[PDB]
Design an enzyme around this catalytic site. Sequence first.
Site, PDB file in Angstrom:
ATOM      1  N   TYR A 186       0.839  -1.130  -0.155  1.00 49.35           N
ATOM      2  CA  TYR A 186       0.090  -0.208   0.139  1.00 49.35           C
ATOM      3  C   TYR A 186       0.804   1.222   0.285  1.00 49.35           C
ATOM      4  CZ  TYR A 186      -4.269   2.926   1.063  1.00 49.35           C
ATOM      5  OH  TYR A 186      -5.207   3.914   1.050  1.00 49.35           O
ATOM      6  N   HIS A 215      -8.783  -7.813   3.145  1.00 46.78           N
ATOM      7  CA  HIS A 215      -7.558  -6.923   2.737  1.00 46.78           C
ATOM      8  C   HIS A 215      -6.904  -7.087   1.450  1.00 46.78           C
ATOM      9  CE1 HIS A 215      -5.451  -4.278   5.952  1.00 46.78           C
ATOM     10  NE2 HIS A 215      -6.701  -4.048   5.795  1.00 46.78           N
TER      11      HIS A 215
HETATM   12  O1  LIG Z   1      -6.769 -10.811   5.205  1.00 54.09           O
HETATM   13  P1  LIG Z   1      -5.768 -11.264   6.178  1.00 54.09           P
HETATM   14  O2  LIG Z   1      -5.626 -12.714   6.624  1.00 54.09           O
HETATM   15  O3  LIG Z   1      -5.617 -10.433   7.125  1.00 54.09           O
HETATM   16  C1  LIG Z   1      -4.025 -10.980   5.073  1.00 54.09           C
HETATM   17  C2  LIG Z   1      -3.539  -9.713   4.731  1.00 54.09           C
HETATM   18  C3  LIG Z   1      -3.140  -9.665   3.262  1.00 54.09           C
HETATM   19  C4  LIG Z   1      -2.613  -8.508   2.707  1.00 54.09           C
HETATM   20  C5  LIG Z   1      -1.039  -8.496   3.178  1.00 54.09           C
HETATM   21  C6  LIG Z   1      -0.305  -7.725   2.878  1.00 54.09           C
HETATM   22  C7  LIG Z   1       0.641  -8.354   1.885  1.00 54.09           C
HETATM   23  O4  LIG Z   1       0.441  -9.524   1.529  1.00 54.09           O
HETATM   24  N1  LIG Z   1       1.678  -7.669   1.126  1.00 54.09           N
HETATM   25  C8  LIG Z   1       1.919  -6.425   1.242  1.00 54.09           C
HETATM   26  O5  LIG Z   1       2.858  -5.805   0.745  1.00 54.09           O
HETATM   27  N2  LIG Z   1       1.318  -5.512   2.396  1.00 54.09           N
HETATM   28  C9  LIG Z   1       0.047  -6.240   3.056  1.00 54.09           C
HETATM   29  N3  LIG Z   1      -0.537  -5.626   4.008  1.00 54.09           N
HETATM   30  C10 LIG Z   1       0.439  -4.286   4.476  1.00 54.09           C
HETATM   31  C11 LIG Z   1      -0.049  -2.974   3.800  1.00 54.09           C
HETATM   32  O6  LIG Z   1       0.414  -2.892   2.358  1.00 54.09           O
HETATM   33  C12 LIG Z   1       0.314  -1.488   4.378  1.00 54.09           C
HETATM   34  O7  LIG Z   1       1.627  -1.694   4.748  1.00 54.09           O
HETATM   35  C13 LIG Z   1      -0.369  -1.539   6.004  1.00 54.09           C
HETATM   36  O8  LIG Z   1      -1.884  -1.604   5.571  1.00 54.09           O
HETATM   37  C14 LIG Z   1      -0.478   0.022   6.626  1.00 54.09           C
HETATM   38  O9  LIG Z   1      -0.521   0.880   5.431  1.00 54.09           O
END
Ligand SMILES: O=P(O)(O)CCCCCc1c(O)nc(O)nc1NC[C@H](O)[C@H](O)[C@H](O)CO
Lengths: 168, 168, 168, 168, 168
Positions: free
Chosen positions: C61, C97
């Site tokens: 993000y 998410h």
């Molecule tokens: O649906 P669940 O189980 O909770 C799994 C989450 C999958 C997404 C994960 C996720 C991932 O797989 N890859 C990246 O790069 N960021 C993710 N979340 C962090 C965000 O990019 C931002 O850093 C943060 O939101 C603050 O701005």
Amino acid sequence: AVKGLGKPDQVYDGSKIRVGIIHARWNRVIIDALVKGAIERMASLGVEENNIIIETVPGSYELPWGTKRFVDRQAKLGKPLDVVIPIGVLIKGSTMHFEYISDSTTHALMNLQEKVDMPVIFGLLTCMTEEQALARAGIDEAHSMHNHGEDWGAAAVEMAVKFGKNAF
Amino acid sequence: AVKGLGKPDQVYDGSKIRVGIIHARWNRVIIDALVKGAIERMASLGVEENNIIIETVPGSYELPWGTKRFVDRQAKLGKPLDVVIPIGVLIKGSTMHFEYISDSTTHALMNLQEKVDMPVIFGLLTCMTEEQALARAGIDEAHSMHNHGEDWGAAAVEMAVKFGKNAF
Amino acid sequence: AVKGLGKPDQVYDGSKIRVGIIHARWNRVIIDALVKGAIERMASLGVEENNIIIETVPGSYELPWGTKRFVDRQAKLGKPLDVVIPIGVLIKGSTMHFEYISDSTTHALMNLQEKVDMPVIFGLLTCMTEEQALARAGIDEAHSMHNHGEDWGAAAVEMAVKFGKNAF
Amino acid sequence: AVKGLGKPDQVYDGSKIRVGIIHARWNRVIIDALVKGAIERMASLGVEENNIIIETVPGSYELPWGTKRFVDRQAKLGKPLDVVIPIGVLIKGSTMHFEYISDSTTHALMNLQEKVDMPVIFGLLTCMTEEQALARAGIDEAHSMHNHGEDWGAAAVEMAVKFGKNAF
Amino acid sequence: AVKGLGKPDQVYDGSKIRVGIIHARWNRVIIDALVKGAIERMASLGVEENNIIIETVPGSYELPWGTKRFVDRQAKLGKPLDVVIPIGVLIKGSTMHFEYISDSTTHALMNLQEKVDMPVIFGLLTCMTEEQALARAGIDEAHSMHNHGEDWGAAAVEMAVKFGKNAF
Ligand SMILES: O=P(O)(O)CCCCCc1c(O)nc(O)nc1NC[C@H](O)[C@H](O)[C@H](O)CO
Ligand SMILES: O=P(O)(O)CCCCCc1c(O)nc(O)nc1NC[C@H](O)[C@H](O)[C@H](O)CO
Ligand SMILES: O=P(O)(O)CCCCCc1c(O)nc(O)nc1NC[C@H](O)[C@H](O)[C@H](O)CO
Ligand SMILES: O=P(O)(O)CCCCCc1c(O)nc(O)nc1NC[C@H](O)[C@H](O)[C@H](O)CO
Ligand SMILES: O=P(O)(O)CCCCCc1c(O)nc(O)nc1NC[C@H](O)[C@H](O)[C@H](O)CO
């Protein structure tokens, strides 16, 4: 009477227009068939062969910015485009890549028209299978449909002649 | 039994407005029925036939830029539109084309209003089947619903009279 | 050793360009393989080692605003980027998410190109599983695909050479 | 239907604010109940009855431009709004119209805030069934939930008092 | 089992920054836990207690405009924010409200960064269930995951230090 009500479907003369075709290179055999169909239909509508400009980009995601810069280059050269046909073939795979590229690319091309100030024809195939894309480029073994590239060439000519920057 | 389209809040007098109708040509029989319904309802509300202007584009994806340029042409001619009704019929096929065109076209028409500075009525049918489209244009064999084009003509008059550029 | 293999489309000389790679840090083993493949491919196309600038952000993000400000920083330093490759790895979990981050990040990166005035390569993996992500970085146990980081490096060079700010 | 949410972080005094409520007329019995609840809640927070302005549009798609022009007319009349509550009720049918109208209307209302320079409360119901909509307006037979229009009135007063154009 | 909150890729000195946290009040027990975790982590990175500013809004849909105006208010006070963390908790219910609010709020927060000219951390949970939200705030009975508010606090410091308006 209502203006234009019942006006028949007309023929467009593309003799004075310049068309750009900018295509991605993934799924190249399909791409090539779509491009050739667009070219043949535009030539049938009068577009001169020297007024059909081809450019390429690696993948469909590169079409929006590639198209923006292609328009820029043509204008700077003194050979501005009147209309452009970005062409790409996207085929669903196992990840969500197909969906995110297709969605962002489609919106970007739609919204690009205001920025390049000309019509941008939607020449992106977004298929679930390669067979579907072959059929939509008129190259499936069964020849079940027809080459949609021809329809895009026709739309480029109509959009340029009726609504291009130089139309009125 | 319930309760969809609401009764117009008042009898709008469309006698001083000019309305543009710009339609795609895919699924033409359905398109024509929708257009006729819109014209009929607008005439019943006082819009003069001479102030109803019809324009066309190849497919629904051309509606946003076609509408932008149709507005420009009408303004340049000294016959500016007060409101426009882009009409298109999209029917789900085998690929994701229906979804990508429907999504980008709907968002583009909504966002076009600030650019053309007038209301743009949502006259796109986004159907899963041909039967559904036929029914929403009032031309299914059983006449199960009614012609939605009529609702779009009523909405155009109301939006132009209450919120058009010249309304206040 | 210039062994080759992937799609024709000319051989691009990246000797005069400066490329930024900005990567997220979630799923770091996959990220690192993607980045290394992009660097290796660009080095094979002539991009100098001191003209490959690396920056990082916490998650995918943060790629859009991170890239905007990385571009700003490099220009203010007198070493402006000709093209940038944001790289991130998103893997579906239990909630939505994944979808909300993937969708908004992809659209933001696409729409960022006009703001940073250079090509922004799409290096965001949007996978339903970790294995899919590994395979697309060339590090799954089966070696079932290839490192897509290489393709991104090649696209960065081509887009900069053909369409970068300094290309024409 | 198990509901969370909290009461302001205080008791907001809406005596100095002017609130616009602009509602669609599709699903009118539900619309009216929602509007009434928003009015009642605002009146209980001190908003004067003469400072609650009601306007209407035909369908939810007309809410964004309708709201833009309603703000404009109020400002032109020397009775500018401090906050507006667009209210519409969308109930899934047989086609994808529900999805396309909901999606474009929701994004458009969100993005309209910058343009009208005031908070725009989200008063669209996007329900799969009529029952669900009846329940969320507090008028289903069983009174299972509560009237969400009340929550929208409360949010309008809080956003205007804390963040309106005239708050600081 | 009490330990240092340090992480090797999160080593950023936040002593000179001011961070805003603006949270919705829907699902307040989860919200409070997320906020607490963000504050704790930023304090561990050097952010001073007087430089962490808290503001609230009713629901997650009000986060984008609330954040825009919170930034305006802080700048007008001569205590401008360097980075802001909008926090909200959305939990799927029976209608499509969850999806429409989630989608428009996520895109609006992402696109807000260019407008407030600072990083906006994505602190929205978009869960299918309450248990999923509880786990992601580190308050499920089981303590199955960890408090994601901590990660957001870390990202806020890194983005401000590395890419904030005053970083270079
Ligand atoms: O649906 P669940 O189980 O909770 C799994 C989450 C999958 C997404 C994960 C996720 C991932 O797989 N890859 C990246 O790069 N960021 C993710 N979340 C962090 C965000 O990019 C931002 O850093 C943060 O939101 C603050 O701005
Ligand atoms: O889900 P899977 O298995 O990985 C299948 C992927 C389908 C999409 C493939 C794909 C395809 O089908 N067609 C085109 O044109 N590009 C695609 N990906 C390349 C991108 O357009 C950009 O070039 C690159 O991202 C750098 O910007
Ligand atoms: O998935 P399938 O089987 O191929 C069915 C396709 C359904 C969508 C069809 C389709 C349809 O149903 N209705 C209209 O208006 N346009 C469509 N496509 C033409 C485009 O609008 C543009 O004119 C063209 O893309 C050049 O810009
Ligand atoms: O899929 P089906 O069966 O056709 C059911 C349709 C559900 C959506 C109905 C629908 C609904 O449920 N609620 C509202 O407010 N408008 C709707 N459509 C009217 C539009 O908002 C615009 O007025 C009109 O498009 C001109 O701009
Ligand atoms: O589909 P169902 O059963 O009705 C469940 C609803 C889930 C979404 C709930 C919901 C939730 O889970 N969390 C937050 O923060 N807001 C929600 N709705 C309030 C809105 O954010 C705005 O405040 C209000 O719309 C006025 O602008």
